[PDB]
Design a protein around this nucleic acid. Structure first.
Ligand SMILES: [Zn+2]
Ligand SMILES: [Zn+2]
Length: 139
RNA sequence: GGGGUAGUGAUUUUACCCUGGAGA
């Protein structure tokens, strides 16, 4: 008997918006840091966010995944702490998100979820703030 | 410029639409 459902964290490795899928690079599996990082499939239907769903390369994610015949596959994908994903830089309203949950219809003062860790304004990482964002720097 | 929409489940960055004497 061995695990069928696992928690993972990492970043979006790439995503094709038109096709609606891509891969995550998993940097931690069940709380264990991995080297090298491993690819986990992600389909648009599993993205936790409001409206047309996407990811951008480099955004911070957590997810639940399983092993399917084709390979590791995400079952649901969120930002850190279970908040909404960011999406493509072309996403309508995507530049005006609640600081706390990433939602599109309110601001942090009105947020109905409890205070979350501070996420980078550009990539949602909880390990840096935007003044030190390497994703923003190589963009 | 400004606004909006969506969809191919396996390997790399998306296809469209609306908008002209006025834009919260
Ligand atoms: Zn919120
Ligand atoms: Zn960042």
């Amino acid at each position: 008997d061995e695990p069928q459902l696992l928690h993972g964290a990492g970043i979006c490795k790439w995503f094709n918006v038109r096709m609606g899928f891509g891969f995550l690079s998993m940097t931690a599996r069940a709380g264990v840091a991995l080297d090298p990082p491993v690819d986990v499939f992600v389909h648009q239907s599993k993205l936790h966010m409001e409206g047309f769903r996407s990811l951008k390369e480099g955004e911070a994610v957590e997810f639940t995944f399983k092993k399917s015949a084709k390979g590791l596959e995400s079952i649901r994908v969120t930002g850190p702490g279970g908040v909404f994903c960011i999406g493509s830089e072309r996403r309508p309203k995507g530049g005006d998100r609640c600081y706390n949950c990433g939602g599109l219809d309110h601001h942090a003062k009105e947020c109905k979820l409890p205070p979350q860790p501070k996420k980078c304004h550009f990539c949602q990482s909880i390990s840096h703030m935007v003044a030190s964002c390497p994703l923003k720097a190589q963009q």
